[PDB]
Amino acid sequence: QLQEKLYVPVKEYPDFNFVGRILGPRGLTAKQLEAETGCKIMVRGKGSMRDKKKEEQNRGKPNWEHLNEDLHVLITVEDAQNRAELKLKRAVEEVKKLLVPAAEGEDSLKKMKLMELAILNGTYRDANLKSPAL
C-alpha cells in the first residue's frame, strides 16, 4: 500500500493535542476521508486509539503498534491509483491546516488564501528568506 505520513512532533507540542485537534471532535472527517478517498488516514504515534477499553482488549494492535511512534497523521491508501492519492492528499491537506498548533481552526483559512497564497513574491522579495509558512 502507499502511506504518506505527515509528522507533527508531539514532543514539540505537549500543550497542543494534535489528536484532540485532528480526530477529537473532527474524527468524523478521518472516517469520511477513508470512506470517500479510499485512503484510511490513520493518526499514528501516541494517542491514535488511546481508549482505555482499547488498551485493555484491543491492546497490542496497530493503535499501540504505532503508539510507539511520534504522533503524525498518515494517509494510508491501499491501491496504486495516483487519482486515489490525489484525493486523499487534498483532504489531508485540509488536515494540514488542522495539525497546525494554532489556537483555533480558522483565520488562517482567510489569511492563507490572501497573503500566505503568495508570501514571498515581487512585492516582498526578502520575505523569501523568512516566511511564516515555511
DSSP secondary structure of 61-111: SHHHHTTTSPPEEEEEE-S--HHHHHHHHHHHHHHHHHSS--SSSSSHHHH
105 grid coordinates: 481552526
Q: Is the dihedral of CA 78, 81, 87, 91 positive or negative?
A: positive
The residue assigned the cell 486523499 is: 88
**Contact of 66 with 48, CB cutoff 8 Å:** yes
Determine the CATH number of domain 1-134: 3.30.1370.10
Instruction: Give the span between the Cα atoms of 116 and 134, in whole angstroms.
Output: 10
The residue assigned the cell 485540509 is: 94
Nearby residues of 29 by Cβ (< 8 Å), 6 or more positions away: 91, 94, 95
Instruction: Give the span between the Cα atoms of 69 and 58, in whole angstroms.
Output: 18
Any idea where the domains of the chain sit in the sequence?
1-134
Experiment used for this model: NMR
Instruction: Give the span between the Cα atoms of 66 and 70, in whole angstroms.
Output: 8
